Amino acid sequence: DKIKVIKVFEAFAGIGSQFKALKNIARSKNWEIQHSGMVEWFVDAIVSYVAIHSKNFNPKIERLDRDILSISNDSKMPISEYGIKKINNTIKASYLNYAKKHFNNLFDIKKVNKDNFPKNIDIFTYSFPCQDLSVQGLQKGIDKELNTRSGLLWEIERILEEIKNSFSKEEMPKYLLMENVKNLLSHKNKKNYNTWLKQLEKFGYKSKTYLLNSKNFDNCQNRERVFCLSIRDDYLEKTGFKFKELEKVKNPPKKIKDILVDSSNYKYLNLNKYETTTFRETKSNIISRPLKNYTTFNSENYVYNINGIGPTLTASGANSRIKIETQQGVRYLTPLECFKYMQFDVNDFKKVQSTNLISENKMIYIAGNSIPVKILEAIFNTLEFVNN
DNA sequence: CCACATGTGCTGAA
DNA sequence: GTTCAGCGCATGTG
Ligand SMILES: Nc1ncnc2c1ncn2[C@@H]1O[C@H](CSCC[C@H](N)C(=O)O)[C@@H](O)[C@H]1O
Ligand code: NA
């Protein structure tokens, strides 16, 4: 037909919310989404990615490919020689081998360069690490000297700089999409972010920066994220593309109520010891009440009402443990529910669960590290491509 | 100075 | 090396 093949490359791919979003809107856009490649070094994310996005993959005990060396078990630090041996000759190895073979996973962003970076990419995503930018963390920032994990942003600089000299203009990626946390626009972080925008300009891209809340995109979650959408300046001229004003979009609201799964055997928290108050609704539609003398960590001390929206799901700690009040009692959102909270569906979760390799906290961790899928759907709906 | 809103986090004992 | 219960304050707006 006039079906357009969309080659997507996901740097820091995680569980592929970018790929999920693209597949969800594909038929409405008359697209056929294709793996150009990916970069993800986190074992659980790689395994989960494969479970969610593979078709007719049959796991089995395999030797780990000898070049798959730069991977991580915790997502922060590289795995030891021992840890690599423990993966070798297991079913888990075949997930890693498959990511390499069928999805062209290059694993470590440091190892990406002009000789292995695919040409003619239609969409290049880079949801780079958020840990050194999050207000919940230590706020180390993204100064180049400090070599932080969020500073892996600057590897994307390196890659683009390298491919600019070797690729033709037309072989460069058509669109780029950045995601990160709200605090990326803070006063200390603004300088670095502006530095990055000038470079994208220098690389021949026109960009717009969006601050988007998931609650405005058919979700029951307060989650404000920064997106930088970039289009290759000549491709903008050829397509006649224009940036839409996505910050004004206000879809119908959604409540926590609307994603909850019924069960007879949930665990409920004993909170009889802790004083509390009435629920109060904030301007953002978060309805919560505090627990007195629960902890000294503020963000841990709230129970949320299911008739409003909930807080930002984080990968770990307080906001990975989201307490909701139901008629059966107060309980945490489950891993399944956390997947739904990030707008993956039940079937994505069942596939990850069915691997029998990812613990419950790890499933929440990778969901917390992801992006609400329908935000990316909305962003990817604005893109235009030439029929050729 | 105050009150309020809110968090893709961190880490050491076991 | 893992793991997660226990732990605080940054970055705002008004
Ligand atoms: N040096 C490195 N090379 C490659 N990937 C890395 C890396 N350091 C961290 N990462 C990965 O970068 C990811 C950022 S999370 C981004 C979320 C993702 N878009 C999703 O859909 O889930 C993490 O999963 C982390 O494991
Ligand atoms: Na130790």
Numbering used by the authors: 6 to 393
Q: What is written in the article reporting this PDB entry?
A:
M.MpeI is a prokaryotic CpG specific C5 cytosine DNA methyltransferase, and a good model for mammalian DNMT1, because of the same specificity. Like other C5 methyltransferases, DNMT1 catalyzes methylation through the formation of a covalent protein-DNA intermediate resulting from the addition of an active site cysteine (of the so-called motif IV) to the cytosine C6 atom (with concomitant N3 protonation). Crystal structures of M.MpeI-DNA complexes capture the ‘in’ conformation of the active site loop for analogues with small or rotatable (5mZ) 5-substituents and its ‘out’ form for bulky 5-substituents.
The M.MpeI ‘in’ conformation has an inaccessible active site and probably traps the catalytically productive state. It is observed for 5FC, and surprisingly also for 5mZ containing DNA in complex with M.MpeI. In this form, Cys135 is poised for the nucleophilic attack on the C6 atom of the substrate base. The ‘in’ conformation is observed in the 5mZ complex despite the presence of the 5-methyl group. The interactions fix the plane of the base. SAH or a mixture of SAM and SAH is present in the complexes with the loop in the ‘in’ conformation.
